[PDB]
Structures are given as C-alpha cells and as structure tokens.
Amino acid sequence: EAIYCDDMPLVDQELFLTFVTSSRAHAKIVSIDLSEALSMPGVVDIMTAE
Amino acid sequence: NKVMCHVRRVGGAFGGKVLKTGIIAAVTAFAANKHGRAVRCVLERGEDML
Amino acid sequence: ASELLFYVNGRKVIEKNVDPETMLLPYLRKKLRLTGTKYGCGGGGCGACTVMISRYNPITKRIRHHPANACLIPICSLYGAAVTTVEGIGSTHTRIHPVQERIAKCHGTQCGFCTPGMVMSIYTLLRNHPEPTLDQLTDALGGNLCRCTGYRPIIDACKTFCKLFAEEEFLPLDPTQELIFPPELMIMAEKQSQRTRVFGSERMMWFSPVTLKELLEFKFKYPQAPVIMGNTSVGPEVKFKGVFHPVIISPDRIEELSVVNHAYNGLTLGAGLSLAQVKDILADVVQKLPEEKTQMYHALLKHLGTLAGSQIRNMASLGGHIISRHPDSDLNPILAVGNCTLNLLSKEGKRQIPLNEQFLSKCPNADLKPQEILVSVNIPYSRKWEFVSAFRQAQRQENALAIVNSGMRVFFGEGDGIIRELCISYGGVGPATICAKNSCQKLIGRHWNEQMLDIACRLILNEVSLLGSAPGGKVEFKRTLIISFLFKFYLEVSQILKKMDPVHYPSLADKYESALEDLHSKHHCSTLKYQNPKQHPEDPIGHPIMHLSGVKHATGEAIYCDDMPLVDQELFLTFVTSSRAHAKIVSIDLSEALSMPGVVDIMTAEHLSDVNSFCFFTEAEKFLATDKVFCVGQLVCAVLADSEVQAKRAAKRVKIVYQDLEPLILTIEESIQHNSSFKPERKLEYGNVDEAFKVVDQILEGEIHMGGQEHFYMETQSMLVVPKGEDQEMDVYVSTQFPKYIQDIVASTLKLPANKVMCHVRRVGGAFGGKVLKTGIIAAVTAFAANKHGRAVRCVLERGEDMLITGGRHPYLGKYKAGFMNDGRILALDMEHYSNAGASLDESLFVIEMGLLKMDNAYKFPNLRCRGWACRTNLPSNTAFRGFGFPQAALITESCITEVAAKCGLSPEKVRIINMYKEIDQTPYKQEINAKNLIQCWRECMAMSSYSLRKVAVEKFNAENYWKKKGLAMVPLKFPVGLGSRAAGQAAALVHIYLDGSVLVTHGGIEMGQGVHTKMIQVVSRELRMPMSNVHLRGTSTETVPNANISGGSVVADLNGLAVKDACQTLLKRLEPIISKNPKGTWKDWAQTAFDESINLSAVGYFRGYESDMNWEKGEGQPFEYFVYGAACSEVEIDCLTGDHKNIRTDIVMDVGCSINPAIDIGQIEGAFIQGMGLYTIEELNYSPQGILHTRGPDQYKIPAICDMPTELHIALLPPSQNSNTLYSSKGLGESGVFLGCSVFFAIHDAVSAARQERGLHLTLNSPLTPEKIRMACEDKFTKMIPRDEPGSYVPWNV
Amino acid sequence: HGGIEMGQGVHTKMIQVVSRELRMPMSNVHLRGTSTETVPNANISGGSVVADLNGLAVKDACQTLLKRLEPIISKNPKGTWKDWAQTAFDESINLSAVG
C-alpha cells in the first residue's frame, strides 16, 4: 500500500519520456537522424540540445 | 514560486538521487511544459546504472 | 457504418461507432479536455456553454458563422462543421484575442464562470460584424447571464469595439489573420455527397438524410421519429421530462427546406430556416415593401428579438417552432391570425393545410400526417385597411417565456369603416394556442369604437376562460392581460384609422397616447467616480488592479472544480431526492437500479449507520432521510456508478413509496398556527414604546411579505474527493466557502482525525453564501462512498437538483405598528420579524439576530421594540445569503417609513431625512456611531442625481400620461460589519520567500469572485516593497493554513489582509539587518544572504480578530467594528396596462473608506446592487400547495440580464475618512449594495402610487415587485371587470 | 519538515519528537510527506544529519506551540488536546507554528 513515485496513478493524457544515451566514451557527434523515430507509432516529440 | 516539488518517500537513494535526478527532471519538465501534458520518466536498471 | 467527422478549434475530430446521444458540452470537456466551455443550466438560457458553429455553403460559396449553446447540440449534427470554443480564439501560451484581453482588463470578470460564454458571444458577432454597433453587441449577449458583475464592465468592453482601464493600450482588432475555416470542410462540402449518414447504439439510431427524397423515405419508414433541427424543443423535454426517442431523423442543409420565395400575394419561408435568419429576412422585407403590405412581418419582427437569446434564435428552426406548438409560443399566435398555410410533402406528394386553431390544438384532422414533413410556410401580404398587432408580457423584457402573448388582426370595409374580418389569438392561457373565434364572429359588423371594445372585452373573457387552478398560476393577472392587450390593439387601430380617415374617427386623448409606446432602451451609459500624491509609484494599494485570474477567466484556462481532469478510475455520485413535503418513507426498492449498467453502489440512511448525522450547531441532524421526509429535495439515496449518465439513469428507476403526513406547513402564518412548542425569542428594546404611543399624533399598523432568493451561482455544487490509499487519507477538492467545515464533516463521517482529511480550494465560481452547509453534507456522503470503494468520487449537481437541494434567502414577514408625529417623526416603533426557515432552524436564528441589529438602518428611533422568530416549514431549509438578514429587515423598515409618509402627506424622502441619525448618535443596542458619512452620502447623492429637478420632471410626466407612470425614490444605507465574537474574526496566512527572491503566499480566505487573492498580493507588494509579479498564490488548503474561519461576513479581505500583513512584517523585521547592509540590492540578493546567515524565510501571519460582543439578554453590546454608509437613487417607468417596467437611471454614493482596489470595489457595488434589484423585482420562487418548487414555463427563475440593468448608472465613492482599526483604513463592502436595490422597488412603488392617486384609489406592495403585482395595483376598468373565483373553490397551481 | 524519507526512518523519529514535546501519543500525530510548498529552502537530505537538524526544527515548532498554550493547560490541566485546541481557538491563539 506504500505509494512510491511510479505507483502514482495514471494522470489524464500523460506522456512517457526515455533517453538515447551515448555509446562512445569520447567522440564527435557528426550527425543525428530522427526521421524514422519521429514517424513511428505514439511518438510525440524528440529533443536534442538544439 | 511557480514550481513545487513533492516527495512522500524514496525507495533508497544513498546519495544517488540528487544531481542526475534534477537533470532528468529539468528535461522532463521542459517536455511537459512544451506539450501541455504531464510526463512520466522511469529508468530501467540498465540505463539507470549508466 | 458512418464515421463522424468535424473540427474543433481548427483540429480534426473523427469518431467511429459514435453514440448518437453524445452532446457537445460533455464531449468538449471530458473527451477533448477543453473545459473552457461551462455548464450553467443545460436548458439554453444562461449561455455559459456558448460556442461558435461554422459551415460552408457550397451553393453560395460563403462561410456562415453563428453562435449556439453546446449543451443542446448532439455531436452527430456537426458533420462537416467547425466548432470554436474559448480556447480556440486565444490563450496565454499562444496569443490573447482582443475580446479576451478587453473583457478581462475592463473588469468584466469576477468569478469568471460566465466569461467563456461572454467571450464567444462577442467573438461570434465580431466575425459577422467587424465594425458593429453597441446594439448588435448587446443583442448578442441577450442570452448570456452573469451573477457577479452587473453587466456594466462587459458593456464597457463591448463599447471599445465600436477610468478603470487603459483603453488606448488594448490590442487592435485585425479582421484578417483570424481563424481560418478548415480547408478540408470546404472540400467535402464541394463534393455534394448524396449519401445518408447513419449512426447507432444499443439505445438509439440516428439517420441524417442529405436529400429531400431520403428525408421523405425516412419520414415514412419511421413515422413516429422526430425530425431534429435545432433540438431546442426536443432537447429540453428529453433532459427534464423523461422523453426518449429510439430513432431520430436529422436532415442536413436540404435546399427545399431553406427556400425564401418573394411571391406576389405573399412570401414563403422554408421550415429549415433559423429564427435568426427569418428575423433578418423580415427585417429586410419591411424596408423594401410598402407599409400596408408588411403588417404580418412587422408583428413577427417584433416578437422576434425578444425571443430567447441570439444562441437559441440561431439554433431553432421556423418549422420546428410551428410543429412544437408550445403554448407560450410568441410566433404561432401571430401566424394563427394571418391566414398562413403550411406546405407539406410526403412520398405520396404535396399537400397544403391552413395554420389555424385546429392545427395548433393538434387535432388529427387538421394536423400533419405521420409520414409528412413541413417544407415551408406561406405568410401573405396585408391589404389596405388590414392591421396586425402582437403583444406579450413576461417576467422580464428578454429571454423569458411569455406569461400571456397575443396576435390580433382586423380588416375594415373600405366604404363603411365596418369590421369585415377579425381574428384574435392568445398564448400562455391553456395547453395550446387558442383563438377567440366565437367572440370575433359576434363582433363582425360593428364599428371601431369604445362600445365595441366593451362588448369585445366581455365576450373574449367568457371565451378565453381560465380556471382558478390553471397551470402557470397568475390567473387574475392573465385575465387582465387578455383584455389589456385588446385595449392596446384598440388604441393602435384607432390611431391609424384617425390618421388615414380623420373625418370619421375621434382624436386620441393626450394622456392615452403613451400606452402605444413600448418601454425599451438598448442604450447604456455609466460614470464611475473614485479617488487618488507622495505614495510610492510601485505601491499598488489604491490602484484599480485587474483580477489576477481575469485573463485566465477569458481564455477558459481558469480551473474550476469540475474542470479538473479525470483521475484514474473515478466514479460519479448523484442523489435521489424527496418528492414529498412531509411524508412517511414506507419502502425503498433498489433492486432494479442496482442491476443496471455502471452501478457500483446505492446508499440509504441505513448504509451510513452511525455517521448519518452530524452536529452542525445546536443539534445533530441527518444527511440522508431515514423513515420520514420533511421537504422536497431532501436527500434520500446516493447512487454511485461508473459514469454520470449511468448514475442518473439508475437513480430514476429507484422506487420509493410514500405516505403523506399532516400537517403540511408551507407559509409563515401556517407555521405560527401550528407551533405550540417553545421558541427562543430575541428582542431589542430602546426607550419605552408603550408610553410613547400615548403622545403620538397618529398610529398605523402594516405588514409586508418578502420572498426568498436563489443564489444562482453560475458554477453549481461541484466536488471531487480522492483517497490517497494510505492511512485513510482523503483529499477533498470542493467549491466551498468553508474548507475547515468540509474537513470536519468529512473526517467525522469517516471516523478520522482531522490530520487525515485535507480540503483544497483554488477558486469558486460564485457562492454568495450558498456553498457552505449542504456542500459539506454532499462532501461527507461522497467521501463515505470514496473510502468504502477505494475510488475517487466526483459529484456535480445539475441546475434543477441544485436549486432543490440547496436552500435560498430566507423569506420574511414584517409586522409593524408605528406611532408618529404629523411632521413624520416616528417616535414609537413596535416591530416583528418572521423568517421562513424551512426544514431546519440552525442558519435562521443567526439571520434573525442580524436583522434585529441592523433594522434601524439610517434612522434613530427613540422608542423601539423589535422581536424576531424563525419558523419551520416543509420547504428546503434556507441558508445564509449576501446581506445576512439586512436586505429583509431594512426593507421592512423602509416599507414602514413609506406608509408613515403616505399618512402625513410627505414624500418618503422627506420622512427619511427627518428620521435620520445625527452626526453623533446611538443605536438600539447602545453603540455610539459617527454618521457624518451617512449624512454626506445622502447629500452628495442628491446633488449627483439632480433629485429635485428630476422629482419635478417625474410629477410632470405623471400628470400628462395616464397608462404610463414614472417613479423616483432614494434610500439611505447603514450596513454594520461585525461577526459577533472575536474568535469568529481571526485569520491566518503563510508566506514563503524562496532563494531566488520570489514569494508564495496563502491564507484562509476563499476566492469566489470578490478578488481577495488580488488584494492579498496587493498587500504583499506594499509590505515587502516588491512588484506584484514577484509574488504568487496557488489557492486555499487546510494543509497550509489550518483552523480558518468561513469566507463570509464581509470581512474576508479585511482579516486575511491583516494576517498577510503580519507575516510580511515578521519577515521584514528579520531582514532589516541585511537590507541596511545592502540597500541597493534585489530581493534575490537579500534572500540568498538570509539563507547564508541562517535566517528563516518562512513566516506564519495571524490576526486575532476584531473585538465584538452582544448581550441579547440586556439587548446591548458592541457587535460591529465599522459601518458602511451609502445612498442610492433609482428612477423607473412602468406600464400600467401590463405591469412591465424599465429601470431608467440609478445613482449610488458609497462610503468605502480607503478603497484597496477601486475596480474590485466598484464591481462589488454593481453586482450587489443588481443582485438586490432582482431580489426586489423579478426573482420569484413559486411553490405548489403540495410544497413542490415549480420550474417550467413562466415559472422559470429569472436573474437580471442586460435588459434589466439600468439605462444610466452613476456610482461615486465618498472621499475617504480615517479608519485606523481596519486594514489600510478600508471598509469591507460587497454585502452592502444588495439593499440599495430596493431603491428600484420604492421607485416602482412611487409610480404605482401616482397612478392610484390620479385614479382616486386611497397600499401594500410585497417583494418581489413582479409585473403581476405592479399590474394589479394599477386598478382600472379592466381589473374591475375580470371574473374571479371564490377563494376555497379550487386547488391553485401556486400558494 | 525539509527532510526526505529514504528508508532511514526520519519521519518516524520526527513523530517520536512531537509525541514527547507536546506530550501526546504518536497516533495523534500524522505526516504526509515533504514539499517545497510547506517548508521552503530546505537543504539536501544527506550528510548523516537529516534526523538531527529536522528534529531540532520540529522540536522548535512544538516548543513555540507549548509556550502559547501554557496559560490554557495550566487553567485546565486535566483536559485533552481537543479541549486545549478548541479553547485556544476561542481565545484567538494561533495553532500553527514554523520551526
């Protein structure tokens, strides 16, 4: 019965956020392609540093 | 005075729920304000440890 | 098979397998999450659900915009259309529309619940008319209701599209870059599809034919199915009268039904035309055609424009109006006398029938065949010597159903002046529109003279007879209106005949001519006067700061209690109320209701066991009825279901068997006859009245009755209770005035400590004292449901059940014996106050106390004895109301002063002056008062209003007019302010200063539209010397500020302001060392420095309360802290033949002290005055001999609209004096202006006296002064002629 | 208070403090959680001192309330906390306190 954070009920029309993390320990980011990911089911937005 | 933080309980932290927690909360809140929706962000064990 | 496609706010909406019963208002709020559109009544009368409908006509390639009420729109009728809500035209996170900016910045919002409807009505007009007149804007708002503002600031915002605000800073309107009509809708409209659209469910089938051939086919296959057009007749009867249709036919823009043919003999209007379109067609024809031909259209053009508001006129269809055959129809009686024919059509073929008396009576031989539709209606041109008139009288001028209306027509023989044809039709005098065809037949052959008029009157009275038990009541009033309209029709025809043929007819008497002019003025004017050297510019105290939520009110972004989003798996609760005034509960059958879809639980008194009761004041009382019911509307059952629709359906199949009990008490005199038990008497005694009656020159005994009043908060009772799931914690979100009381009754019902239950209130959409007692009872029952089933539960009441469950203002009976000198000095007064308390007495004994302590008003009665009692009746128990007994008690006193003035032969104003308190004087409770501002308010009101000049002009008018009289009156005001105890006046606050310099403040007060949160931040901005933008407030909660008193008593801003001031001063004392060390620093610098030096930045503010005491045994004490003084002058004109009246001008001067916010305070005077004006005039509650509140037809409750607001309104605030005891020398107003509305009451009393005095009749006018009471007091040949019934020979509709 | 419950039992110790300082059972005290809307400018819940410092702050608020009420308890020493609280409201004594 103890309510932890994720135990809180679904509030109306709430969205979910997950992160794409780095797979390199020290590298240049030469390009990022979101075109496929943006067009997939459920996707509302994808944010970068820009 | 526009932003309020509420915490009932934490399922363990040991110093690991401070800095990066705020970075994720800042990015999550930016998403929530941008799209006028509540946003949930819960990490899996793998991406958490990383 | 079909899908539903339409647009809302520019975005596409697709629904597959739609439920055809779905309505637009719940769809917008719960499906699309657009809660800007509000629920107000659900009958099309209030306009809080006003939206804009856009359609593209592919034939005329034009886009049409028109307003509509979303509560009556089924979404299946929106295919291919575009809806626009408040959120569509602007928002704070996109761009504010000029309409939203101005209605907010002009202070046209208080509680803000009606603002979304106001915005959409104004916005929809500006799209059709970007450069409009004020007449067009006021007409668009005719169906929009507001309980807070008095309409004056909203009209000021409307005027800007043709001081308290900077008009020159408003955003300019740009007719371009407005909302673009969705291009896709234009495309599918161009593809003129012929396919009939089909929607269905288990309960309903919906057919939308788009061709005439398909419409005739569905009319044949489903003959009993209704042809829905505007749903303004079938909609309400489905919602309120339990009507259900399994199959619905709803055609879509069929050209044959919208034909406008300008024929040679007449003109033909299609049945699909809206009443607003017909109004525009007829308004154009009466200009392009000669006047002798446009007689029928002028009469229809007259009753159109008083018919409902702009929203209903744009929804309702012409054919729907004729087929509906409402008895109160304003158009059918005109069409009945005009030789109109109905063009019918069926799969068989064409058919033409006359629109006569038999058709309106639904005789099958003259009705439509089941398989036929009404295509169009022929309305012929009038001939020479043919005249048509239309008359009507309602509770108010517009948006109110007619008590009696009429249509009359004459045709004269050209060469003899003899009546060749005559047809008179009346509405609102029976089940259907009737025609006096027999009396008309007997009048054929006569001439147009007074002798024919007398015969006609006696004839129709015999033919158009009503029983004493006629539904709607007002029987004698209806009888008088029938022959009064005939008299007006006689004078109208007599004048045009004298104009056309002067040698054969006499001239009208000069005093008689005013009866032909109707009372009207859509022109509105107003002036506002207030005060303003070495005060800091950044100090906002005294400046007209806008309401903090003003813009959020206009954009629909303000969150009210029902606007909160759907929490997970929440349930809905609705109540089964009592249908008997006093009866035994024999049995309750829940078996059927429990088995219906969605039903989770149903609770009775036995299911609540030992928590069914609660001790509110003096005794424990039940939430739900046990074995008896003591009034209609008493709570019996609570139905809990998965949805609101399922809960209401289940509640209706609950079976309750009653057995009526005697006695059945309804009136105060009945309560006195049957009460032989002890009743706590309460008395004030000043001087010696028994000895004073021996010296007085004259003595009079009089009494006056006064009806109650419904609060009519635009937001109905609403609450959402949510269990946390831990330790039985309960969060209770309620629209209430008393969060601490909600906490007590909920925790007590759950057997929990107070620390487990928290009540949170952000804002209340109006309350006026009506969201306290019953709100907690509902909240306690909802919370019991929530805890029992582990679910959040929502409870929102509909307007009908809201008016039944909650109480209203206490009706009063005042009885006085006055002893007075010949000069008017009342040296002896023996007063008696009686209050209709309802089923319970706890609230009423406090309103009797306050009535006695304030009945003196502005008068020093040297020898006074007052006494008061509360009386139980089998009616809904009445609650507190704005004024708290003063509008009743002071109206009793002014009625006695008016009666004294009549005996001594002076104006009531001369008697008021000589009886007024001196500058230094003493009250009956032996409190010393300073009445300099009372005398000043009276002096400056006389100068500002030009009373002496107008007094001469009104007497001059009454001398030259017989059937119309003007009236004038001025009343003074002394509203004392005090709660009776010091503990009742304590307040608290909590202020945080965060390290970035920003401030969060909260307090115990509740925002109900009075702007207390705005004033609280005005205080913080001064005390801590920061801009108001640096401080924010979220709401009110028992988790932040505990033990807060009720938000009432005219002191919410006073006490919470002193508490907020206390917290700010505590923080400034702590920070003074830092401020002196860094005086050029910012609040961010000071706050961070305080944190670094370990200085607390949180502080609790607290005020102990004003000193107050009252010893009722001695009748002495010091109960009040200060006194609000003022005076008001009102001028009216009445129609002696109909009871209609027009508020011409009102002037108000008010002692406010030092106004903290003049915009808020002036708005409090306007709203209170208008709310009082309705209390004394048009607002009327009608109960049956069985104790049932009547609510249909002419019995509908009417609050003041725009047409009721005075044409001219001058308001001035007295230059301030010193009041060091109060916050910034201010005075808590907002309850005081209610009594000032009686200045209109006694102005009508003045006009009625002028008619009775001229006619030689030598007066007791009760409140409210309805058109019924005004008309019957103006006795004449007509009132003396009507038939009357013996008093006990019938059971009437009303008591 | 400003402390955070991570499993170390700080809320249990806080109510243990209130139960002693106000001389009332722990069942008469309740805590909901932590919020910046009720207690502002709170430090990090760390450094092995969370119960230490918030305990002294909770103790400070309890002593402020006990000082305000002391005239009322000494007038009715046999009374309950319900009696003392209602009497404080009737005599216009603030029952909220920041520690």
Ligand SMILES: Cc1cc2nc3c(=O)[nH]c(=O)nc-3n(C[C@H](O)[C@H](O)[C@H](O)COP(=O)(O)OP(=O)(O)OC[C@H]3O[C@@H](n4cnc5c(N)ncnc54)[C@H](O)[C@@H]3O)c2cc1C
């Ligand atoms: C708030 C409010 C205020 C009002 N005020 C007034 C007022 O002041 N004065 C006044 O006179 N009236 C007033 N009315 C009544 C209003 O004028 C009528 O309800 C309206 O004109 C009916 O038209 P409708 O299109 O809404 O009908 P619907 O509700 O769509 O239909 C009503 C009936 O008409 C039938 N029908 C419609 N079209 C056809 C057709 N082509 N062929 C056959 N049958 C057809 C339907 O089958 C149904 O039986 C008011 C109504 C409301 C809701």
Ligand SMILES: O=C(c1ccc(OCCN2CCCCC2)cc1)c1c(-c2ccc(O)cc2)sc2cc(O)ccc12
């Ligand atoms: O025949 C008349 C008529 C007859 C007598 C009149 O009397 C004129 C005044 N008379 C003078 C003598 C003493 C009594 C009053 C007037 C009109 C017509 C009329 C009339 C109007 C009122 C009324 O009460 C009676 C009749 S109206 C008319 C129209 C016509 O085309 C022809 C005749 C007429």
Ligand SMILES: O=C(c1ccc(OCCN2CCCCC2)cc1)c1c(-c2ccc(O)cc2)sc2cc(O)ccc12
């Ligand atoms: O301010 C009061 C009030 C204050 C003291 C009262 O009596 C004190 C005794 N006490 C009452 C509650 C049960 C326990 C005994 C009664 C009402 C008002 C109310 C109240 C407050 C708390 C509560 O638990 C129940 C009702 S309701 C109300 C309506 C008004 O118009 C004015 C004051 C009020």
Ligand SMILES: Nc1nc2c(c(=O)[nH]1)N[C@H]1C(S)=C(S)[C@@H](COP(=O)(O)O)O[C@H]1N2
């Ligand atoms: N807009 C608005 N103004 C209102 C009311 C209301 O419900 N809505 N209630 C009145 C009542 S009943 C009272 S007692 C006061 C309470 O607030 P105040 O003391 O700050 O004037 O507001 C008055 N003005």
Ligand SMILES: Nc1nc2c(c(=O)[nH]1)N[C@H]1C(S)=C(S)[C@@H](COP(=O)(O)O)O[C@H]1N2
């Ligand atoms: N169960 C539990 N115990 C815990 C922790 C935790 O996350 N969970 N954190 C530790 C850390 S990092 C600190 S600094 C302290 C903080 O609380 P305290 O000061 O009351 O001991 O709790 C310690 N004990």
Ligand code: MOS
């Ligand atoms: O005092 Mo106003 O809430 S009846």
Ligand code: MOS
């Ligand atoms: O001090 Mo523990 O919060 S790292």
Ligand code: FES
């Ligand atoms: S007009 Fe529809 S809710 Fe009032």
Ligand code: FES
């Ligand atoms: S502000 Fe209009 S109803 Fe309250």
